[PDB]
């Protein structure tokens, strides 16, 4: 019967893959959405353990001994995309809160801008996510392992950083650095007055920053869903082989 227990766990994985796919196809990923994605991918990992624990050649005949390949796609692929999505989504959500506070930092003066309030908020964003890498979730890996995943995640959202014990793929904070440097270039005394024309380029610039970061996140979500779809197709073949 243990062969059928395997098929019941493999079928529980596809059931989770189905819910995971829907969650990732929502335009906006909320803090609630992330909590659900963590549970599903976590439930995935558990059943991938029981599968290997519990563990026609026509149907078998590329990204993927059966246990040493399913545990390979999840450990060194699905879990990586998952945590990358979590970290970047949390960063973006925290960035959106700063932009939401922007309206209350502008007033007529011709526009007066609270450059200090904006700068210090973005500084906190940078400080907060300096030790929240995309990959790995804990500890470190080899510089070569870190680079392998930078190419897979993209140099737009990630950068290999040296940390105690080895290397990680950190969040690329260049966009935040871009904003902070731009704010420094404005000068002032805590506040600054911008002619209407210059403020219009900054407001529209802030909105463009947001859309760029949103697009970065959606691209990463796309890669996680694609990997999950490759993983589901591998599970598919097994559920029909054991049957």
């Amino acid at each position, epitope marked *: 019967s243990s062969l059928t227990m395997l098929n019941d766990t493999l079928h529980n994985i596809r059931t989770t893959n189905q819910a995971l796919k829907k969650e990732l196809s929502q335009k906006t990923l909320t803090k609630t959405s992330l909590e659900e994605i963590a549970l599903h991918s976590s439930q995935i990992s558990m059943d991938v353990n029981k599968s290997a624990q519990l563990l026609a050649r026509e149907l078998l005949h590329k990204e993927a001994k059966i246990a040493n390949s399913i545990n390979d796609i999840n450990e060194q692929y699905l879990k990586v995309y998952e945590h990358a999505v979590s970290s970047y989504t949390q960063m973006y959500q*925290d960035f959106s*809160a*700063v932009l*939401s*506070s922007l309206a*209350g930092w502008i007033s007529p003066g011709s526009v007066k801008l*609270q450059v*200090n*309030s*904006l700068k*210090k*908020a973005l*500084e*906190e*964003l940078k*400080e*907060k996510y300096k030790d929240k890498p995309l990959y790995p979730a804990n500890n470190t890996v080899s510089q070569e392992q870190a680079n392998k995943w930078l190419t897979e995640l993209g140099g737009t959202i990630g950068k290999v950083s040296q940390k105690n014990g080895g290397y990680v793929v950190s969040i690329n904070m260049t966009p935040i650095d871009n904003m902070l440097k731009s704010l420094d270039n404005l000068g002032g005394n*805590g506040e600054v007055v911008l002619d209407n024309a210059k403020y219009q380029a900054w407001n529209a610039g802030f909105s463009a920053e947001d859309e760029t970061m949103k697009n970065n996140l959606q691209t990463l979500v796309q890669k996680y869903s694609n990997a999950n779809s490759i993983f589901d197709n591998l599970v598919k073949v097994l559920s029909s082989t054991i049957s």
Partner: nanobody
Amino acid sequence: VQLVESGGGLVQAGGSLRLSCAVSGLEMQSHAIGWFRQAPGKEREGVSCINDDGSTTRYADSVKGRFTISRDNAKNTVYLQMNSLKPEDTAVYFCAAKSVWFCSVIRSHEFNSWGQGTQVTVSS
């Protein structure tokens, strides 16, 4: 949302006090929490703030190096260690929370919830 301060009282100039803020009614791990003070006649004044995960703390120039803010997301408590107290520090001290995760410049009108305050009196 309820914010309850304790730890105030009377103290001699040069002495110290530790304020404690009991936070009830909000996911404390998601909001910046800070301390304000208001002496009579003078305007409310930002003192310190600590963002939702504690990776940044902020202090007014008047208290930098003397005060220390800390938070315990577990115990739903925020502390303000007040050392090297001066008569200038005499005021009602308020615990306050923001709707956002970050501190930025401490500004009273950007804080969502307020405690009743507790008196700190420094006599030289």
